[PDB]
Structures are given as structure tokens and as C-alpha cells.
């Protein structure tokens, strides 16, 4: 147990500096030492990697490593991301050394000779490194070919295939932080939100909110994070399509009332003009009639637990603004009419 | 309904009239289906004066109920429609003088003095003469 700490941290440091362009002093000696250590780790993951205090101890060490670094400023180094990546740490290191242009020639040669001896060692008991790298190239080409010859961007994002992989990555990253319990998920989500492209992130969130559990703590954390942060939810309900938010809300009743408040507020900031028979907003970024009609139509074409809720939230806002029965006076009258 | 004192159904009925005047054309003499009305119910002067009439008739009901912004919108539209009626302007300038007098008031004086009946039907003439207030030019000289 303690024997493995100085091994693992040392390997993580060597790996992290591997990707860095200081590689001048490296030699066949360094690379051999690297790969023998990596063999030891790959063996460990195999031997006693499941169901013990050792697995959880290593996870603790890894996640503490990944949070003391965090991934801000001095280096956004991946590192081996999780306990499963121990089983292929040696491949990562190798890939990084092939990317380091600053690698010396004799080092590179010894390296490539140790990855690719040839078919002289076609018979091997352990799935060796050359097979692993060939099998990696295969998968990569397979992924490219499906994307450009078969794949189609599904409209029902939940059922698409890129988004559903991102989602499950995010969900794994929430579960790991929950078990870690060092810093709260809200912090992780906030940091994510600043770094990377927001509209993409939001699409992803929508779909992650719907994936069934893989042990619903994942979704349960995100609902709380979102209800805490209004601005994102302002851009959330603004960016996605209708049916997705409809399925979201039927799934999570905690999201229903606020979302209706958001829609109700966009209704109340329209004005009718008599010359063109259309509700319009004054400002340009105020949702147009068509989008607001869309969302309400999606919400009303839903399971009954939500249909009565949205319908009642609309009638109460109609009666609130004078109980007219004729168009040109109340956005809420025009909605209730454009439903029958 | 106004004269019987029912704000709600009044604004309702005015609105329904306003809808029919803009989301339909009366001069569709494309298909001669009958003894259509040749003259009284075709005149564009009748259409524009009636538009303005119903906008005013509505705007005053927002005022009576205390919804002066909606009233303002209706009077503005009426001004856009018939700028040579001056019944419009009395009501518009009365509202701006109540809320935000100076610049817009003088701006519409200038519009009037830029501006300065032909063959209407009789029911419309009598409706306009009826709703209009006696103290118009006095206020229009203020
Ligand atoms: Zn006629």
C-alpha cells in the first residue's frame, strides 16, 4: 500500500513532464525505466484492481492530485484521468513522447523499437504494447468513418450519439467528485462554465439530465446547481429546443415552476401592434411570438402531471391582466386561443 | 356599451371592430356576387376616417379605466392613419400634456401647422361629430 504511493506519484510526475517540451536529457535509460514502471502499474490494475481498500486508496490519491492541480493556470495537464486509465497508462506516455518534437533521436529510436519490434514476437501471453497501438489506430479510423458516412445529427438530442457520450463523461466526473467530497459540485460546475464553450456545455447538460443511473445522484446535483444559478438557466431555456425541455420538465418537477416563470416573464414583455397582426417585442433579444408559441405548445403536449400545471399557470396570468375574450389585448388570450 | 358604462365589453367591441378593419379588405370587387354596395361602403375616405374613429373610441376607454399607456398607443395609431382630422391631435396632445408635455407637444403642433370631409357616409359623420369635444381648437391654440 505505502510502497505504491512513491511509485504512482513518481509516475504521474514523469508522465506530466513527458508532454512538456523540456525533453533534451531523456535517453533509452529514462524510457526503459518509464515503461517498466508502466508495466508494473498495468499489472497492478489487473491483479488487485477491483473491490478492495487499495482501489479506493489509489482513487483518493489520484483525485487529490487532480484537485490540488485543479486544471487552472500553470498547466491543464490531463494526467491519467481515473483508475481505469491505469490499465492503459503506458499507451498514454508513449503517445505523448511521439508528440514531443524535442525528443532526441536515439531515445526516439529505442522507444519505437520497444513499441514496434516487428512480428518477431507475434506469440505473447499478455496483450502487448504493439497490439494495443494497432487496435487504437483501428478504433480511431472506425470512428472517423462512421462520422463521415453513416452518422447523422439526431434532432432528439437525448438519443444522439456524440452528446450521449459527453453526457456520460460529465456524469462520471460528478460521481467521482461526490465520492471524493473534497470540494462541492457547484464549484466544479462553475469552473467548467467559464472555461469551455457555453452553448455546447448547455446542450450537453440537457442530455445528461436524462441519462438513467449507472451505479439518480448525477441529475440530482445538476438540478440544484441550476436552480442556484439563474443566469445560465436564463440562457438554458433560451437556447434548447422545445421537446427537449418538455421531456426535462416532466422528468424533474423541480424544474417546472421556475421555467414557467421564465416563459411567463417573456410574455409580459411583449406588446401588440395593430398594423401587423403579430405580437412583437420592443427589444430584439425578446423571444418572438413564434418561439414562445412553440415552447408552450410543446409543454401542453406532454403527460397530464405537467399539462394541468402549465394550463393553470397560463389561465391565472390571463385573468391577472383583465379577462378579455378577443385578440389584441392579452398575450395570454392569444396563447390560449392558438392552442384550440 | 360605453354610454351604459361597461368598460370591459366596450374595449372588447372596439377591438373587434379594429381587427375587422385591418385583417380584412372591404373593397374586394373581384367577384361580382350580388347587388353589392357600390359607393357608401367602399370609399377609402370612409375606411380611414372609421379606422381613426374606432382607435379614438378605444383610446378613451383605456383612459376611463386608467390604462393611459394603452390609450396612448391607440391615439398614436389614429394619428398615423388620419393626420388631417385634428380630433386625433386633441386627444394625443391632451395625453402628452398630462404625462410628458413639452417636446412632443410642440413637435405635434408643428405637424398640425404642416397639415393646415369629401364624401363620407352619414352614420360615420354623425358618429364623429358626436364623440368630438367642443373645446378642440381652443386647446389646439394652447
Ligand atoms: Zn353601403
From Swiss-Prot, chain A:
Annotated consequence of substituting residue 209 to R: Reduced monoubiquitination of FANCD2
Coiled coil residues, start to end: none
Keyword Cell wall biogenesis/degradation appears in the UniProt entry: no
Gene3D superfamilies: 1.25.40.490
Recorded consequence of changing residue 329 to A: Strongly reduced monoubiquitination of FANCD2
Keywords carried by this UniProt record: DNA damage, DNA repair, Fanconi anemia, Nucleus
Pfam families (alphabetical): FANCF
InterPro entries: FANCF, FANCF_C_sf
Domain of life: Eukaryota
Gene Ontology biological process terms in this record: DNA damage response; interstrand cross-link repair
Location in or out of the cell: Nucleus
Effect after changing residue 236 to R: Reduced monoubiquitination of FANCD2
GO CC entries: chromatin; cytosol; Fanconi anaemia nuclear complex; nucleoplasm
Associated clinical condition: Fanconi anemia complementation group F: A disorder affecting all bone marrow elements and resulting in anemia, leukopenia and thrombopenia. It is associated with cardiac, renal and limb malformations, dermal pigmentary changes, and a predisposition to the development of malignancies. At the cellular level it is associated with hypersensitivity to DNA-damaging agents, chromosomal instability (increased chromosome breakage) and defective DNA repair.
Quaternary assembly: Belongs to the multisubunit FA complex composed of FANCA, FANCB, FANCC, FANCE, FANCF, FANCG, FANCL/PHF9 and FANCM. The complex is not found in FA patients. In complex with FANCA, FANCG and FANCL, but not with FANCC, nor FANCE, interacts with HES1; this interaction may be essential for the stability and nuclear localization of FA core complex proteins.
Free-text function comment from the UniProt entry: DNA repair protein that may operate in a postreplication repair or a cell cycle checkpoint function. May be implicated in interstrand DNA cross-link repair and in the maintenance of normal chromosome stability.
Alphabetical list of PANTHER family matching this protein: FANCONI ANEMIA GROUP F PROTEIN (PTHR14449:SF2), FANCONI ANEMIA GROUP F PROTEIN FANCF (PTHR14449)
Name of protein: Fanconi anemia group F protein
Curated annotation (Swiss-Prot), chain B:
Compartments in which it is found: Nucleus; Cytoplasm
Chain ranges passing through the membrane: none
Effect of residue 138 to T: In a colorectal cancer sample; somatic mutation
Repeat region (TPR), residues: 1-24, 52-85
Ranges in coiled-coil conformation: none
Lineage: superkingdom: Eukaryota
Tissue: Highly expressed in testis and thymus. Found in lymphoblasts.
Effect of mutating residue 84 to R: No effect on HES1-, nor FANCA-binding
Free-text function comment from the UniProt entry: DNA repair protein that may operate in a postreplication repair or a cell cycle checkpoint function. May be implicated in interstrand DNA cross-link repair and in the maintenance of normal chromosome stability. Candidate tumor suppressor gene.
Quaternary context: Belongs to the multisubunit FA complex composed of FANCA, FANCB, FANCC, FANCE, FANCF, FANCG, FANCL/PHF9 and FANCM. The complex is not found in FA patients. In complex with FANCF, FANCA and FANCL, but not with FANCC, nor FANCE, interacts with HES1; this interaction may be essential for the stability and nuclear localization of FA core complex proteins. The complex with FANCC and FANCG may also include EIF2AK2 and HSP70.
Disease with which this protein is associated in UniProt: Fanconi anemia complementation group G: A disorder affecting all bone marrow elements and resulting in anemia, leukopenia and thrombopenia. It is associated with cardiac, renal and limb malformations, dermal pigmentary changes, and a predisposition to the development of malignancies. At the cellular level it is associated with hypersensitivity to DNA-damaging agents, chromosomal instability (increased chromosome breakage) and defective DNA repair.
Protein name (record): Fanconi anemia group G protein
Species assigned in the record: Homo sapiens
Gene field: FANCG
Amino acid at each position: 500500500m505505502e510502497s505504491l504511493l512513491q511509485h504512482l506519484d513518481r509516475f504521474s510526475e514523469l508522465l506530466a513532464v513527458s508532454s512538456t517540451t523540456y525533453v533534451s536529457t531523456w535517453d533509452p535509460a529514462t524510457v526503459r525505466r518509464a515503461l517498466q514502471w508502466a508495466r508494473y502499474l498495468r499489472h497492478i490494475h489487473r491483479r488487485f484492481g477491483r473491490h478492495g481498500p487499495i482501489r479506493t486508496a489509489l482513487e483518493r490519491r489520484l483525485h487529490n492530485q487532480w484537485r490540488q492541480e485543479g486544471g487552472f493556470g500553470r498547466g491543464p495537464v490531463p494526467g491519467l484521468a481515473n483508475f481505469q486509465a491505469l490499465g492503459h497508462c503506458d499507451v498514454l506516455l508513449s503517445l505523448r513522447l511521439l508528440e514531443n518534437r524535442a525528443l532526441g533521436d536515439a531515445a526516439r529510436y529505442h522507444l519505437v523499437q520497444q513499441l514496434f519490434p516487428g512480428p518477431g514476437v507475434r506469440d505473447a501471453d499478455e496483450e502487448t504494447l504493439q497490439e494495443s497501438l494497432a487496435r487504437l489506430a483501428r478504433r480511431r479510423s472506425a470512428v472517423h468513418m462512421l462520422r463521415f458516412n453513416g452518422y447523422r445529427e439526431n434532432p432528439n438530442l437525448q438519443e444522439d450519439s456524440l452528446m450521449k457520450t459527453q453526457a456520460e463523461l460529465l456524469l462520471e466526473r460528478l460521481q467521482e467528485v461526490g465520492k471524493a467530497e473534497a470540494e462541492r459540485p457547484a464549484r466544479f460546475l462553475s469552473s467548467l462554465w467559464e472555461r469551455l464553450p457555453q452553448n455546447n456545455f448547455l446542450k450537453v447538460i440537457a442530455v445528461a439530465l436524462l441519462q438513467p443511473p449507472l451505479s439518480g445522484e448525477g441529475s440530482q446535483v445538476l438540478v440544484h446547481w441550476l436552480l442556484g444559478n439563474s443566469e445560465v438557466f436564463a440562457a438554458f431555456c433560451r437556447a434548447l429546443p422545445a421537446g427537449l425541455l418538455t421531456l426535462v420538465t416532466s422528468r424533474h418537477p423541480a424544474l417546472s415552476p421556475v421555467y414557467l416563470g421564465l416563459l411567463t416573464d417573456w410574455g409580459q414583455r411583449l406588446h401588440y401592434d395593430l398594423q401587423k397582426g403579430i405580437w412583437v417585442g420592443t427589444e430584439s433579444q425578446d423571444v418572438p411570438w413564434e418561439e414562445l408559441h412553440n415552447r408552450f405548445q410543446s409543454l401542453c403536449q406532454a403527460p397530464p402531471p405537467l399539462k394541468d400545471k402549465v394550463l393553470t399557470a397560463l389561465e391565472t396570468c390571463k385573468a391577472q391582466d383583465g379577462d378579455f375574450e378577443v385578440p389584441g389585448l392579452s398575450i395570454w388570450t392569444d396563447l390560449l386561443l392558438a392552442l384550440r | 356599451w360605453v354610454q351604459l358604462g361597461a368598460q370591459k365589453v366596450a374595449i372588447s367591441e372596439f377591438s373587434r371592430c379594429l381587427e375587422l378593419l385591418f385583417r380584412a379588405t372591404p373593397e374586394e370587387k373581384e367577384q361580382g356576387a350580388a347587388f353589392n354596395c357600390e359607393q357608401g361602403c367602399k370609399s377609402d375616405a370612409a375606411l380611414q376616417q372609421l379606422r381613426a374613429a374606432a382607435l379614438i373610441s378605444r383610446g378613451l376607454e383605456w383612459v376611463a379605466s386608467g390604462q393611459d399607456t394603452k390609450a396612448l398607443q391607440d391615439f398614436l395609431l389614429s394619428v398615423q392613419m388620419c393626420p388631417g382630422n385634428r380630433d386625433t391631435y386633441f386627444h394625443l396632445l391632451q395625453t402628452l400634456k398630462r404625462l410628458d408635455r413639452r417636446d412632443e407637444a410642440t413637435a405635434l403642433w408643428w405637424r398640425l401647422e404642416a397639415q393646415t370631409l369629401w364624401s363620407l357616409p352619414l352614420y360615420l359623420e354623425s358618429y364623429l361629430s358626436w364623440i368630438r369635444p367642443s373645446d378642440r381648437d381652443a386647446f389646439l391654440e394652447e
